[PDB]
Structure 1
């Protein structure tokens, strides 16, 4: 495992496992694409509301 600091040295898609927060270790990876909660989430929800 790494520390939340060492995660600074990763590529745009490299996977590393870090000690997140107070305790548990979770495998982590940098994100591709913005991946926000903008209209895209609304479309899946409002389309069904027809």
Structure 2
């Protein structure tokens, strides 16, 4: 997960769920709420939302193998 890599605390969601309509910056991503997502650019060209920690993690284990969404279910 190159997206979450830089962040060092998010998960790899994807370019969907535009229902959020955030499009904010990373500096604000930290103010987000756990279990929630937020669309942030990772190259000024790809708009994808991230997924906060499911509880607690230093860098939040992730993987770029799942771009559609994350490999975890939050309820």
Normalised TM-score (structure 2):
0.37
Larger fraction in helix: 1
5+ unaligned residues in a row in structure 2: which ranges?
1-22
Aligned length: 50
For structure 1, which segment, 1-10 or 17-26, has the greater mean C-alpha deviation from structure 2 after superposition? 17-26
Asked whether 1:20 is paired with 2:39, we answer no
Shift of 1:23: 3.2
Shift of 1:13: 1.0
Contact 1:12 1:30 (C-alpha < 8 Å) held by counterparts: yes
Which structure ranks higher in relative contact order (CA pairs < 8 Å, sequence separation ≥ 6)?
Answer: 2
Stretches of 4+ moved more than 4 A in 1?
33-50
Normalised TM-score (structure 1):
0.50
5+ unaligned residues in a row in structure 1: which ranges?
none
Q: Who wins on radius of gyration, i.e. which is larger?
A: 1
What root-mean-square deviation, in Å, do the aligned CA atoms of Structure 1 and Structure 2 show? Answer: 9.1
